[PDB]
């Protein structure tokens, strides 16, 4: 879908006693399972996408809250952006005492009707003003025949859920270990888009996974001036960009209210609230003072207008991988401007890969920025993983240093090791062989930070303290490697350290 549309998601639990207070074991509880799910996807969505909408609803309860079509349904929460007080409302109903806390309020086991329940949720999504990209309902019921004993009750539901799917709201399901069996082919076969224990999907809602997830958006758009005249529009996209702990919002102590930092400039002698025109900019050199205006400290540092000028072609081997400037950015075509320029770009991509070549360009991302120099290395897609595109096809902008960047480094000379000293090393190295994958690690600080932040947010008992994956697991490095550190200590240097 288009950029702005929120994900929006409504959670809809069976309040019926026959599941709600029920267990075959003692070790879980289907309502305590669903509520855990709702709290846990919801705490995922809080860290990861505060912009996307959640609601939660109980059907078949005995005391009601709805706009209309009231009987035996209670909207615990209408659609809203997610936060702490909503997670505290769900927390109240959890656990052995929780399954009594709920009973003092909304009441349990009464008759219900899916064609009314699906009506209610529909009205909910309608009532909200925002643009929605995905509209999804989640069923937390075990009741595999949903009391369609009256087939002329049940045909209402099936038609109404035809109407859900027809209006482009989706609906989705989880089965919840009903004693002895559950089978979708009896009923729910036509409500969703051979026999089950409990859903292999449901564990994915307990991943508790944390990052920002920020959708595909351009960094900027530019014209690749091949010369004085021929241009194509290309995008500039950010495939790799270091995340930061979110900017902290300064607060008033006594009320927790946000407060304005409200800075001004004031003359050291006098009451002049000096305006931006009152003051210049300056330097000191050679015991004299150089004076420039607030226009020209940024008229200096101009050279060009936003674009990409072509500078001619190179071998890919001469672009030496030791000197690297800043993270590489992707280039991909954009018919939003320069229509049909995709036809040129695609031929340019295809044929550079045959030539074993890069294009060299000069690059300005904005007006009032100096040109850097950038090699456009061409790119090719590994769809072989059943069209999981690990690599998009296009170009990489790889940046190149200038003289000033390549800092001087001290004198040293040696070519010291013998073939035995390499030969022992060639063993330890081959014993320590693993497979790195790009996603195999996580930031120890930024992951810890969210766990501290949750403890403070919910008033939990404890910070979760989940230990990081960057420390070497040194006992495994002792054992897999084995004792071979002694080959350095014996064969390579004296015993004095």
């Amino acid at each position: 879908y288009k950029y702005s549309g929120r994900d929006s998601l409504i959670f809809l639990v069976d309040a019926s006693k026959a599941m709600f207070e029920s267990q075959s074991e003692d070790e879980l509880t289907p309502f305590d399972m669903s509520i855990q799910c709702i709290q846990s996807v919801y705490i995922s969505k809080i860290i990861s996408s505060d912009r996307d909408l959640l609601a939660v609803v109980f059907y078949g309860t005995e005391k009601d809250k709805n706009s209309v079509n009231f009987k035996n349904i209670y909207v615990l929460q209408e659609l809203d952006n997610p936060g702490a007080k909503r997670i505290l409302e769900l927390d109240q109903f959890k656990g052995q005492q929780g399954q009594k806390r709920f009973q003092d309020m909304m009441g349990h086991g009464s008759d219900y009707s899916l064609s009314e329940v699906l009506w209610v949720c529909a009205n909910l999504f309608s009532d909200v003003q925002f643009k929605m990209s995905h509209k999804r309902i989640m069923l937390f019921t075990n009741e595999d025949n949903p009391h369609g004993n009256d087939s002329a009750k049940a045909s209402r539901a099936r038609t109404k859920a035809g109407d859900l799917r027809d209006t482009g709201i989706f609906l989705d399901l989880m089965h919840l270990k009903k004693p002895g069996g559950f089978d979708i082919s009896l009923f729910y076969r036509d409500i969703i888009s051979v026999h089950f224990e409990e859903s292999s999907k449901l564990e994915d809602l307990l991943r508790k996974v944390r990052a920002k997830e920020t959708r595909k958006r351009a960094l900027s758009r530019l014209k690749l001036k091949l010369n004085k005249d021929i241009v194509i529009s290309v995008g500039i996209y950010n495939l790799v960009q270091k995340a930061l702990k979110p900017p902290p919002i300064k607060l008033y102590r006594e009320t927790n209210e946000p407060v304005k930092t409200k800075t001004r400039t004031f003359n050291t002698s006098t009451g002049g609230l000096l305006l931006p025109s009152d003051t210049k900019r300056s330097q000191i050199y050679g015991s004299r003072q150089i004076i420039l205006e607030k226009e020209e400290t940024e008229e200096l540092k101009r050279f060009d207008d936003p674009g990409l000028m072509l500078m001619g072609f190179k071998p890919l081997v001469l672009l030496k991988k030791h000197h690297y400037l800043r993270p590489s950015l992707f280039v991909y075509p954009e018919e939003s401007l320069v229509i049909g320029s995709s036809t040129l770009f695609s031929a340019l991509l295809i044929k550079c890969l045959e030539k074993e070549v890069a294009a060299l360009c000069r690059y300005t991302p904005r007006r009032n920025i100096p040109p850097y120099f950038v090699a456009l290395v061409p790119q090719e897609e590994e769809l072989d993983d059943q069209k999981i595109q690990v690599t998009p096809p296009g170009f990489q902008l790889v940046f190149l240093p200038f003289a000033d960047d390549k800092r001087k480094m001290p004198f040293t000379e040696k070519i010291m090791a013998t073939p035995e000293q390499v030969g022992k090393m060639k063993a330890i190295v081959e014993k320590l062989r693993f497979t790195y994958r790009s996603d195999s690690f996580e930031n120890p600080v930024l992951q810890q930070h969210f766990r501290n932040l949750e403890a403070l947010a919910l008033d939990l008992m404890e910070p979760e303290q989940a230990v990081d994956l960057t420390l070497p697991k040194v006992e495994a490095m002792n054992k897999r490697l084995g004792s071979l550190v002694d080959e350095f200590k014996e064969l390579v240097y004296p015993p004095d350290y």
Binding site: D7, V209, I388, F441
Partner: peptide, 23 residues
């Protein structure tokens, strides 16, 4: 389609479970 797309956060690709060094 389903195979790579997360149920917690749709359209976005499924976050695999952290890994680290193991031989």
């Amino acid at each position: 389609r389903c195979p790579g797309e997360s149920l917690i956060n749709p359209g976005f690709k499924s976050k695999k479970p952290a890994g680290g060094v193991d031989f």
